[PDB]
Design a protein around this ligand. Structure first.
Ligand SMILES: *[C@@H]1O[C@H](CO)[C@@H](O[C@@H]2O[C@H](CO)[C@@H](O[C@@H]3O[C@H](CO[C@H]4O[C@H](CO)[C@@H](O)[C@H](O)[C@@H]4O)[C@@H](O)[C@H](O[C@H]4O[C@H](CO)[C@@H](O)[C@H](O)[C@@H]4O)[C@@H]3O)[C@H](O)[C@H]2NC(C)=O)[C@H](O)[C@H]1NC(C)=O
Ligand SMILES: *[C@@H]1O[C@H](CO)[C@@H](O[C@@H]2O[C@H](CO)[C@@H](O[C@@H]3O[C@H](CO[C@H]4O[C@H](CO)[C@@H](O)[C@H](O[C@H]5O[C@H](CO)[C@@H](O)[C@H](O)[C@@H]5O)[C@@H]4O)[C@@H](O)[C@H](O)[C@@H]3O)[C@H](O)[C@H]2NC(C)=O)[C@H](O)[C@H]1NC(C)=O
Ligand SMILES: *[C@@H]1O[C@H](CO)[C@@H](O[C@@H]2O[C@H](CO)[C@@H](O[C@@H]3O[C@H](CO)[C@@H](O)[C@H](O[C@H]4O[C@H](CO)[C@@H](O)[C@H](O)[C@@H]4O)[C@@H]3O)[C@H](O)[C@H]2NC(C)=O)[C@H](O)[C@H]1NC(C)=O
Ligand SMILES: *[C@@H]1O[C@H](CO)[C@@H](O[C@@H]2O[C@H](CO)[C@@H](O[C@@H]3O[C@H](CO)[C@@H](O)[C@H](O)[C@@H]3O)[C@H](O)[C@H]2NC(C)=O)[C@H](O)[C@H]1NC(C)=O
Ligand SMILES: *[C@@H]1O[C@H](CO)[C@@H](O[C@@H]2O[C@H](CO)[C@@H](O)[C@H](O)[C@H]2NC(C)=O)[C@H](O)[C@H]1NC(C)=O
Ligand SMILES: *[C@@H]1O[C@H](CO)[C@@H](O[C@@H]2O[C@H](CO)[C@@H](O)[C@H](O)[C@H]2NC(C)=O)[C@H](O)[C@H]1NC(C)=O
Ligand SMILES: *[C@@H]1O[C@H](CO)[C@@H](O[C@@H]2O[C@H](CO)[C@@H](O)[C@H](O)[C@H]2NC(C)=O)[C@H](O)[C@H]1NC(C)=O
Ligand SMILES: *[C@@H]1O[C@H](CO)[C@@H](O[C@@H]2O[C@H](CO)[C@@H](O)[C@H](O)[C@H]2NC(C)=O)[C@H](O)[C@H]1NC(C)=O
Ligand SMILES: *[C@@H]1O[C@H](CO)[C@@H](O[C@@H]2O[C@H](CO)[C@@H](O)[C@H](O)[C@H]2NC(C)=O)[C@H](O)[C@H]1NC(C)=O
Ligand SMILES: *[C@@H]1O[C@H](CO)[C@@H](O)[C@H](O)[C@H]1NC(C)=O
Ligand SMILES: *[C@@H]1O[C@H](CO)[C@@H](O)[C@H](O)[C@H]1NC(C)=O
Ligand SMILES: *[C@@H]1O[C@H](CO)[C@@H](O)[C@H](O)[C@H]1NC(C)=O
Ligand SMILES: *[C@@H]1O[C@H](CO)[C@@H](O)[C@H](O)[C@H]1NC(C)=O
Ligand SMILES: *[C@@H]1O[C@H](CO)[C@@H](O)[C@H](O)[C@H]1NC(C)=O
Ligand SMILES: *[C@@H]1O[C@H](CO)[C@@H](O)[C@H](O)[C@H]1NC(C)=O
Ligand SMILES: *[C@@H]1O[C@H](CO)[C@@H](O)[C@H](O)[C@H]1NC(C)=O
Ligand SMILES: *[C@@H]1O[C@H](CO)[C@@H](O)[C@H](O)[C@H]1NC(C)=O
Ligand SMILES: *[C@@H]1O[C@H](CO)[C@@H](O)[C@H](O)[C@H]1NC(C)=O
Ligand SMILES: *[C@@H]1O[C@H](CO)[C@@H](O)[C@H](O)[C@H]1NC(C)=O
Ligand SMILES: *[C@@H]1O[C@H](CO)[C@@H](O)[C@H](O)[C@H]1NC(C)=O
Ligand SMILES: *[C@@H]1O[C@H](CO)[C@@H](O)[C@H](O)[C@H]1NC(C)=O
Ligand SMILES: *[C@@H]1O[C@H](CO)[C@@H](O)[C@H](O)[C@H]1NC(C)=O
Ligand SMILES: *[C@@H]1O[C@H](CO)[C@@H](O)[C@H](O)[C@H]1NC(C)=O
Ligand SMILES: *[C@@H]1O[C@H](CO)[C@@H](O)[C@H](O)[C@H]1NC(C)=O
Lengths: 115, 135, 441, 106, 135, 135, 115, 115
């Protein structure tokens, strides 16, 4: 499988952050967990939420209702939207694939939340 | 009600009729999933064979999936899978007798997979429950 | 109290059966030609525990299916374009004397003929350069005028190998295993299942395997019944040997029309110096990989025996010389310079002279030709030697001074190095089982 | 909310010394604990599953042990390729939780 | 048991497990008996069509043989026909928790023709008894 | 019942039999509707494929109307639809044992479409009546 | 749809009247009502009977048992037979197809009942 | 079906009697019951035993272990062997086809048990 993140690298504060993960080499309608994970400055990881092949949604409670995660199964892509952003949400955003003691990550993209 | 007032409903005639009125139109739809080429070289030889097998295995795909849910041999069946308030926040009076089937599938097109997966898991749940009480 | 029989449907039960396969390729050509269905590249490799399934090569019909498959693919891409019916004309050939070397004296023939033009009532005189392996005396004629008419190879297509995946319809499965010490035929303790395979290169060879899959940990001497000398011995490398094959000739291609809308490309006049086509392998890694092979050849024989290497037995040019498909023009390479070794108990390159043939005889049927058109420029190839094919000789006395020789000629052994892991099975879902039921009346 | 607490953040070591990393769980839940290795500029890679068993390709010098609320990962005979960040986790119930992470220095 | 430890067995994953562990995974195995070539010249012109109709006829032969026995539409169906113990003199404790279906087939492969033929004679007898009693 | 009186019915062996004797013989006439081509270029790439997919489509056509009537998977289905006496003025004793089924089909050949369409009209009503009593 | 009537234009009294309706452009085994309608001298219409798509029958009671209506599904034709004719039954005979607010009539044919 | 008996017409007492029945026109492995019947001097018939398509054997208990009946399915033949013969076993031996209210007999052959 290959994962590639895409989207705008600059987002104005209080506006919405949208990123696309383009997946190739595997079908998002079959199995395992499809996650978004970000790495802050200072090398700390925080899990935001996941998806399942059947469309179920789960999120880290610390992020409250700030996150909706959605997908397009025709294009084999899934999407992150993050409302009400702050400069402490600046981080490198990864879309990663987990299960059956397998772990594959995209290369990641950099985003800076500033005006 | 008879003569010129008689209704024979054609094929696909319940597309604009409401969901409640289309609950008695299920028979005429299913009979047109196999026939049509009942009466009969590279051109137009493989083109029928490619289309004939495709028209059969898609019907078997929708019939095998019915049998996994326990709905084999029935047209209107209903299981014990609880569909919840997040999928559609409407009562039964706001779904059946005021709108049709065609745009009803568009709101459920995102939730088609989550519906289909729970039905096949719930049938296998009650197969083992049948084994315990029978023994 | 007494158990009664039930029916279980869909349970995994296997049965060794053979069915037809199906191509699958990633994103014209000579193998794909945009005809194979582009599969999703998701190999569902579910590892299976406590499963021992007996594999069997030399009875697997996948290599029989694959050999039959690309024979029809070779003839499919040669039909819709032009053949070479009017080239059977008496020639006027003379030795090329334009900047030639002492070794290639007489290799190239400067032949002129009276081949017809686009108008049926006129003729033209066209000169071309032909190799000495394509013309014989009658002053000369093509070597296959007493054989059937030949195609043109239609240079819009290419012969570059493209990965191809073989897998079965629904109701069947493919089982593969990843044992490091896997022999030819035996029970394998790491059987997994997959939808279908990884990339398989259909590249063609007769003596040395090129661009194959490397071994897992060590070189495996993989063959059947070994006291017999009539069966080949297949060797798979773990560390590849890089081979460079080139030809520095400045070939010029002339486009000559044979008739209405039917072009033909031939070798024009040469520019520069005439030199051979030489293949280079390093003497360090070849001696290193020869010792690593005879170390594994001593497991099936004695420890104090003498293993000797000799060249091919001779005869036809297809089996004796090294044949491959790099650069678009075929190389028939003398290969006596790699087997100068005697192995007993306890400078960075090797030159190999080669012959270039234009009239090409492919698989052992005689009624088919292959005419590779000339290509502009210089052919440069970077390939890997990832295998060997060895044929034993009889008449061994007292099991001493036993030697190994190359040979074969059967092209099915090229794909046994790639299909040594996969087998096809048939899923039987229906079955019975006894437990405690009673049908409710 | 199972909280995974790691002992300390940065510790200096020398090549050839035994080093042991520790992780303290808020509850004694199970033995289903995993360690991940992350080198700079690379994604994390799974190392140990079910606390005591090794993954394919993982070198024999990596061992792990412990139960209850206490789990010890031991590196022995450290080479240059073991420079990385290591994380303890639990995989029993959602939400997923990460350690703060430990960075090795040579 | 979550995250990387969740169950995502998929197709043919329970082929090495025990009797009771493989009995819960009959849904996922029969799912891959029709699909797979759902997405689409002489060569592979006859090979493609012969690929599908061979696969369709085996699936229909299994369902029709199931429908003769009266177990159509069910994944785990069980009848009330006795069987002679000479085929296997083993109790349920020594079979249903410690062995795999692969080695079970070779021990009863001698008697599949016998045990199948005792099922249509069994199933037709309730239908004969249903016709006498209910009339 | 033995010797000359033994049962060796085979395929279609009860063709000239009485309807009571042929009612036991519906099992053997079902399996020979898909088999025969179980074991295996312009000619016979079409002559074999066109007849193999035709046997599939004729079999699924017979099964599907057996599913619309609501009792698929049953060899002898007896539903709850009254029949008009104008089609055949013969009682039970003058049908089941005095005449062969072959000439009986010609007698009801004209009245086939009346009785084939009335079955599903009383089955959708049956499934609607099942929904009201269930809830 | 096109309908075309055919048959003998002269029938002797007390004998049987037979007419053929040849139908083209539509199948008599699918839908709607297939009728025979006649027009008397003086422009009066009397309905004789109908057919269902499944081959069911029905007749005007005023005609008693004098009418049998039949069909041939191979030739896509249906048929009228009228027993015991009288000269007051002389009229122009139409075969018509009615339903779903679509009424189509044939061109008609003329018949005289006389000795 | 046609049945033809063959074998030696003279057998010495206490030795074994072997006869072959050659069957043509029908396969004995998907089939009816195949019997041996003999006719004594004085025209009395006694049934010895039968065979089935599945290889099961049946014999008259009065003959004890004196008879083994066997077949060759490649040649579509079945065989009689009779041990410990006596002159009261002299008879005309028939191989017979019986079933489905049909009965076919071979022409028979004569055998005399004498020294
Ligand atoms: C390939 O074959 C091997 C060995 O045959 C299988 O591995 C285990 O095999 C045993 C033998 O039947 C299974 O039985 C289980 O025994 C448990 C207790 O025994 C010990 O188990 C482990 C060591 O294996 C120790 O850690 C433990 O402390 C015990 O000392 C029982 O507890 C099991 O019952 C139930 O346990 C829990 C309770 O919730 C459940 O999670 C279980 O699923 C089970 O319902 C059981 O009787 C054992 O299950 C096998 N292990 C596993 C992981 O399945 C391999 O499984 C087999 N390969 C495949 C693919 O099946
Ligand atoms: C075993 O495998 C190896 C590698 O998989 C094979 O080596 C390749 O062989 C093919 C043909 O056999 C060569 O293709 C030729 O390349 C000639 C020179 O290419 C240069 O010029 C190109 C046009 O200007 C230019 O695009 C190219 O750049 C890149 O293009 C390639 C795609 O076309 C790409 O894959 C390369 O990475 C390359 O960097 C070069 O600058 C060209 O003139 C010919 O027309 C023809 O296309 C490959 O170049 C070989 N690969 C390498 C790395 O050299 C080998 O043949 C296989 N063995 C056998 C027996 O077939
Ligand atoms: C012929 O033999 C040679 C060796 O003699 C063999 O060499 C290969 O060379 C290529 C190009 O240099 C290597 O390709 C890449 O190598 C890098 C390391 O420099 C790898 O990391 C790459 O692997 C992955 O890299 C990314 C990270 O996952 C992925 O995005 C990417 O898609 C790759 O999956 C990449 O392979 C190659 O590694 C070597 N091979 C070996 C074994 O070292 C060459 O393969 C031989 N040719 C044939 C046809 O067999
Ligand atoms: C063709 O017609 C003849 C009639 O002339 C059929 O003969 C019939 O054969 C059956 C064989 O099963 C007889 O049935 C039996 O009846 C007895 C009672 O007499 C009963 O005990 C048995 O169990 C069995 O049911 C039937 O009586 C007999 N008919 C007559 C009038 O005696 C013949 O079989 C027909 N050919 C066929 C069906 O192929
Ligand atoms: C198309 O929509 C109209 C809506 O106006 C439907 O008309 C209704 O028909 C039902 C019975 O058929 C009546 O009880 C209502 O009074 C009608 N009017 C309404 C709801 O305003 C019409 O039936 C629909 N067409 C079809 C084929 O169902
Ligand atoms: C084979 O040919 C290549 C073509 O240049 C030689 O050069 C190597 O090229 C590869 C890339 O194609 C580089 O990675 C190597 O570093 C090059 N080698 C050197 C020494 O510069 C290569 O040396 C040739 N090999 C042999 C054995 O002749
Ligand atoms: C293959 O090897 C031969 C010999 O090792 C190479 O021939 C040399 O070519 C250069 C010119 O490039 C000359 O200066 C040398 O004198 C030649 N060597 C000898 C021994 O005469 C040849 O270039 C190599 N080819 C490739 C593609 O690497
Ligand atoms: C393989 O090696 C042998 C030598 O062992 C070669 O045989 C020589 O052939 C030439 C003519 O073809 C003779 O002049 C020599 O006398 C032969 N050698 C001996 C020792 O008799 C043989 O040609 C080689 N084959 C190839 C294809 O290179
Ligand atoms: C392949 O090359 C080898 C050597 O490069 C050739 O062997 C030579 O054959 C001649 C013929 O008489 C002998 O005089 C030499 O002594 C041989 N040399 C060696 C090293 O054995 C061989 O003939 C070539 N094969 C072909 C088919 O051309
Ligand atoms: C369904 O999905 C599409 C695309 O993923 C999205 O645009 C749409 O809003 C979704 N509908 C609902 C009701 O969430
Ligand atoms: C959705 O349904 C599940 C059961 O099917 C239930 O547990 C869950 O609470 C429902 N979701 C919401 C938001 O209520
Ligand atoms: C041409 O080459 C051949 C090949 O050996 C040779 O026999 C002949 O003598 C040559 N002729 C001339 C004129 O050089
Ligand atoms: C081949 O012959 C032609 C005939 O004129 C000549 O022009 C050409 O130079 C010759 N080629 C060589 C290599 O001598
Ligand atoms: C080609 O034709 C010309 C016609 O003048 C003739 O002189 C010449 O000899 C011919 N050459 C050959 C090789 O036939
Ligand atoms: C064709 O001629 C060549 C030249 O001698 C010869 O080797 C070959 O055997 C011949 N082939 C046939 C089929 O006559
Ligand atoms: C593997 O090699 C052959 C191949 O079947 C087999 O007979 C042999 O027993 C196996 N083991 C060894 C050590 O050769
Ligand atoms: C082949 O294997 C058999 C054992 O199956 C062995 O007896 C025989 O010597 C071997 N070699 C030949 C040439 O048959
Ligand atoms: C060979 O000569 C031709 C003739 O001009 C030239 O186009 C080509 O570039 C040359 N090739 C090399 C490698 O120099
Ligand atoms: C090749 O290896 C053998 C093995 O020891 C050695 O004797 C020989 O000298 C080596 N040849 C070269 C050229 O290094
Ligand atoms: C040959 O030597 C190896 C060690 O290099 C040894 O394991 C093997 O047993 C020896 N072979 C015999 C037949 O003794
Ligand atoms: C191989 O090379 C050695 C090294 O001199 C030589 O003695 C031997 O004759 C050569 N063999 C062949 C077949 O060329
Ligand atoms: C016992 O097994 C035999 C199989 O040879 C079978 O014919 C018989 O009916 C069985 N007996 C019982 C009581 O099931
Ligand atoms: C059933 O037959 C097969 C093949 O003839 C044989 O291998 C097997 O042992 C037999 N079963 C029993 C229980 O003997
Ligand atoms: C059935 O129809 C045919 C032709 O349509 C007719 O000849 C026959 O009399 C009809 N049978 C009855 C009972 O009406």
């Amino acid at each position: 499988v290959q994962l590639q993140e895409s989207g705008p690298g600059l987002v104005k504060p209080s506006q919405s952050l949208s990123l696309t993960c383009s997946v190739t080499g595997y079908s998002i309608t079959s199995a395992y967990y499809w996650n978004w994970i970000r790495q802050f400055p200072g090398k700390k990881l925080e899990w935001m939420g996941y998806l399942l092949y059947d469309g179920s949604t789960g999120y880290n409670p610390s992020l409250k209702n700030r996150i909706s995660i959605t997908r397009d199964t025709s294009k084999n892509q899934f999407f992150l939207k993050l409302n009400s952003v702050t400069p402490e949400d600046t981080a490198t955003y990864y879309c990663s694939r987990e299960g059956n003691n397998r772990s594959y990550w995209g290369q990641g993209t950099t985003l800076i939340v500033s005006s | 009600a008879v003569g010129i007032g008689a209704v024979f409903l054609g094929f696909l005639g319940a597309a604009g009729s409401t969901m409640g009125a289309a609950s008695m139109t299920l028979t005429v739809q299913a009979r047109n999933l196999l026939s049509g080429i009942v009466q009969q070289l590279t051109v137009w030889g493989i083109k029928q064979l490619q289309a004939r097998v495709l028209a059969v295995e898609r019907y078997l795909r929708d019939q095998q999936l019915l049998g996994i849910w326990g709905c084999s041999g029935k047209l209107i069946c209903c299981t014990n899978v609880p569909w919840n308030s997040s999928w559609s926040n409407r009562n039964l009076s706001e779904i059946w007798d005021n709108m049709t089937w065609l745009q009803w599938d568009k709101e459920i097109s995102n939730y088609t997979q989550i519906i289909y997966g729970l039905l096949e898991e719930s049938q296998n749940q009650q197969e083992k429950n049948e084994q315990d009480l029978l023994a | 109290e007494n158990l009664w029989v039930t029916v279980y449907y869909g349970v995994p039960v296997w049965k060794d059966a053979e069915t037809t396969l199906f191509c699958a390729s990633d994103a014209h050509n000579v193998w794909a030609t945009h005809a194979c269905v582009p599969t999703d590249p998701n190999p569902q490799e579910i590892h299976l525990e406590n499963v021992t399934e007996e594999f069997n090569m030399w009875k697997n019909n996948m290599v029989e299916q694959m050999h039959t498959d690309i024979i029809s693919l070779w003839d499919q891409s040669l039909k819709p374009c032009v053949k070479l019916t009017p080239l059977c004309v008496t020639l006027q050939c003379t030795n090329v004397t334009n900047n030639i070397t002492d070794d290639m004296r007489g290799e190239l023939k400067n032949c002129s003929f009276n081949m017809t033009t686009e108008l049926r009532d006129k003729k033209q005189k066209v000169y071309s350069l032909f190799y000495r392996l394509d013309v014989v005396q009658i002053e000369y004629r093509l070597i296959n005028c007493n054989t059937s008419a030949c195609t043109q190879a239609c240079p819009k297509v290419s012969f570059e190998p493209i990965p191809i995946h073989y897998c079965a319809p629904a109701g069947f499965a493919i089982l593969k295993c990843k044992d490091k010490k896997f022999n030819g035929t035996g029970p394998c303790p790491s059987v997994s299942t997959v939808q279908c395979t990884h990339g398989i290169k259909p590249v063609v060879s007769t003596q040395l395997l090129l661009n194959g899959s490397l071994a897992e940990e060590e070189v495996m001497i993989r063959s059947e019944n070994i006291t017999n000398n009539a069966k080949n011995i297949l060797v798979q490398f773990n560390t590849p040997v890089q081979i460079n094959c080139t030809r520095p000739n400045n070939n010029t291609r002339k486009s000559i029309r044979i008739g209405p809308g039917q072009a033909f490309y031939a070798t024009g006049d040469i520019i520069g110096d005439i030199r051979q086509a030489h293949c280079n392998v390093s003497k360090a890694t070849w001696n290193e990989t020869l010792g690593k092979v005879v170390k594994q050849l001593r497991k099936h024989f004695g420890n104090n025996t003498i293993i000797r290497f000799a060249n091919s037995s001779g005869g036809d040019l297809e089996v004796t010389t090294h044949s491959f498909n790099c650069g678009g023009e075929f190389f028939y390479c003398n290969t006596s310079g790699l087997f100068n070794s005697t192995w007993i108990s306890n400078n960075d390159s090797i030159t190999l002279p080669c012959r270039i043939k234009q009239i090409i005889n492919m698989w052992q049927r005689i009624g088919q030709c292959m005419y590779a058109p000339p290509i502009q420029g210089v052919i440069r190839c970077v390939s890997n030697i990832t295998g060997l094919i060895l044929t034993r000789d009889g008449g061994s006395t007292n099991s001493t001074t036993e030697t190994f020789r190359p040979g074969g000629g059967d092209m099915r052994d090229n794909w046994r190095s790639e299909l040594y892991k996969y087998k096809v099975v048939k899923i039987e879902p229906l079955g019975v089982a006894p437990t405690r039921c009673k049908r409710r009346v | 909310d199972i909280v995974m607490t790691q002992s300390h953040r940065f510790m200096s070591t020398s090549v050839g010394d035994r080093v042991s990393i520790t992780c303290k769980a808020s509850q004694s839940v199970d033995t289903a604990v995993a360690w991940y290795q992350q080198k700079p500029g690379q994604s994390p890679k799974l190392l140990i599953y079910w606390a005591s068993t090794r993954h394919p390709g993982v070198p024999d010098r990596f061992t792990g042990s412990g139960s209850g609320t206490d789990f010890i990962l031991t590196i022995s005979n450290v080479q240059s390729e073991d420079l990385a960040d290591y994380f303890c986790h639990q995989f029993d119930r959602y939400p997923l939780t990460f350690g703060d992470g430990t960075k090795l220095e040579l």
